[PDB]
Amino acid sequence: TQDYAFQPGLTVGELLKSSQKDWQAAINHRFVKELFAGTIENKVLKDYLIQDYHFFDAFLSMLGACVAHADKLESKLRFAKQLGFLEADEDGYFQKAFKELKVAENDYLEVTLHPVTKAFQDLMYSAVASSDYAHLLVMLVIAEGLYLDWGSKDLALPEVYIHSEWINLHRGPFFAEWVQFLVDELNRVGKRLTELQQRWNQAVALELAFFDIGY
Amino acid sequence: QDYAFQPGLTVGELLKSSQKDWQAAINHRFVKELFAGTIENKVLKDYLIQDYHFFDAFLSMLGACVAHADKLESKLRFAKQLGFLEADEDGYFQKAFKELKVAENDYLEVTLHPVTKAFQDLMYSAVASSDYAHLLVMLVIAEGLYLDWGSKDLALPEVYIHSEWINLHRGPFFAEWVQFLVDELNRVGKREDLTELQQRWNQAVALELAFFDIGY
Ligand SMILES: [Mg+2]
Numbered sequence A: 001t002q003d004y005a006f007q008p009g010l011t012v013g014e015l016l017k018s019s020q021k022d023w024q025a026a027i028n029h030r031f032v033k034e035l036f037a038g039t040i041e042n043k044v045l046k047d048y049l050i051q052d053y054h055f056f057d058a059f060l061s062m063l064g065a066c067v068a069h070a071d072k073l074e075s076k077l078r079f080a081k082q083l084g085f086l087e088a089d090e091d092g093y094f095q096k097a098f099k100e101l102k103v104a105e106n107d108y109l110e111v112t113l114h115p116v117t118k119a120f121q122d123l124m125y126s127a128v129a130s131s132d133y134a135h136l137l138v139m140l141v142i143a144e145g146l147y148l149d150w151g152s153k154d155l156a157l158p159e160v161y162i163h164s165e166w167i168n169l170h171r172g173p174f175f176a177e178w179v180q181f182l183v184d185e186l187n188r189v190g191k192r193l194t195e196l197q198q199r200w201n202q203a204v205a206l207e208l209a210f211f212d213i214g215y
Numbered sequence B: 001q002d003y004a005f006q007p008g009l010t011v012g013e014l015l016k017s018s019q020k021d022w023q024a025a026i027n028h029r030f031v032k033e034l035f036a037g038t039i040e041n042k043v044l045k046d047y048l049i050q051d052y053h054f055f056d057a058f059l060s061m062l063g064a065c066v067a068h069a070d071k072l073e074s075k076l077r078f079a080k081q082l083g084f085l086e087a088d089e090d091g092y093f094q095k096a097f098k099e100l101k102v103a104e105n106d107y108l109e110v111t112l113h114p115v116t117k118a119f120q121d122l123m124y125s126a127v128a129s130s131d132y133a134h135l136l137v138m139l140v141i142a143e144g145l146y147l148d149w150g151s152k153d154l155a156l157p158e159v160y161i162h163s164e165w166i167n168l169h170r171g172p173f174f175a176e177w178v179q180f181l182v183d184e185l186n187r188v189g190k191r192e193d194l195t196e197l198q199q200r201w202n203q204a205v206a207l208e209l210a211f212f213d214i215g216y
Helices: A009-017 A020-027 A030-037 A042-069 A073-100 A105-109 A115-130 A133-151 A161-168 A173-190 A194-210 B008-016 B019-026 B029-036 B041-068 B072-099 B114-129 B132-150 B160-167 B172-189 B194-211
Strands: none
Touching: A009 A020, A009 A133, A009 A173, A009 A194, A020 A133, A020 A194, A030 A042, A030 A161, A042 A073, A042 A105, A042 A115, A042 A133, A042 A194, A042 B041, A042 B072, A073 A105, A073 A161, A073 A173, A073 B041, A073 B072, A115 A133, A115 A194, A133 A173, A133 A194, B008 B019, B008 B132, B008 B172, B008 B194, B019 B132, B019 B194, B029 B041, B029 B160, B041 B072, B041 B114, B041 B132, B041 B160, B041 B194, B072 B160, B072 B172, B114 B132, B114 B194, B132 B172, B132 B194
């Protein structure tokens, strides 16, 4: 009975039941509230974005592994489209945000990885190493679906670019239809759930933990 | 031998042993007839149907490079090319199949030519290796050999289905992409398994040559 910004369907609907407390805590996190308000401190957003750019590095790799291992050309093409979008608009945002926050290249590329970032990369790269489209989709449905869920909150957008654009990259019809594609794909291939569910639960917990990094 | 790209050290070495096949491929009847606008619809159709299955595995290799490259800047460049391919190259295939009256089932659900199958096996073994250098061998050949014929000093043909296949493998954007792939193979290749990279390299050039015979 929990409503989400996407339509979970069968397998994703099942997977979601065990992660509800963490999922709701993540989308209602102080980070999200302060980002929408425009009140989030620069030092908090900066620390989050530096770590998130390392998440982004592994996230790109998971998308690439889906192009590599998906079973349908139509699906490979959709991942390819998303990769093009991410290189233009999302990497463009990171570059602009780092410039605004006065972070030199070496200080966003050559970083101490927070333990949560390290845990996430390990889990993301084990999905890559599995060469298993369903394991990759678990990670991606969570990363993108949970971000759509907070991104689509009914709160007025903040004024400053570094705030509004991070919301906008995770909101609106294009991103919503992308998330529904990922969900549809996990439902298609998932109807296989113990190891998928254990991965799912851990990844939702890490999404929640990630929002505390900057605080 | 001159090439449309700058081979550098490792790629320059790898090219030595595939020269006969490389030169035969870039001067193949297919290329000649495509530039001249004389290629028969049947020939181009049969090539494109098989090449769309090459394209399927080709996308997968680019994806595997996003997965396994050692630098974020490189991952991003592969991501940018994947976006280009989904828009402009898949767009061309769809338009070409419409023009050539090939229904979706008749380009998706078809008999793979023995050369197409051999190429897919070699491409998927590069994916399975998770080894950026092996993937780059395949891509430097696929893209660099196509730049080499695409950049011939000839005016483009009149008809869209001819000109656009050349266009997709010609010009500064594609040339810079090829040079990026060559630069990356030189960077990561400079390897205790040069023999194995060479074996893969020679076989892929041979299959590029054989692929042009499919439509004939
Ligand atoms: Mg607001």
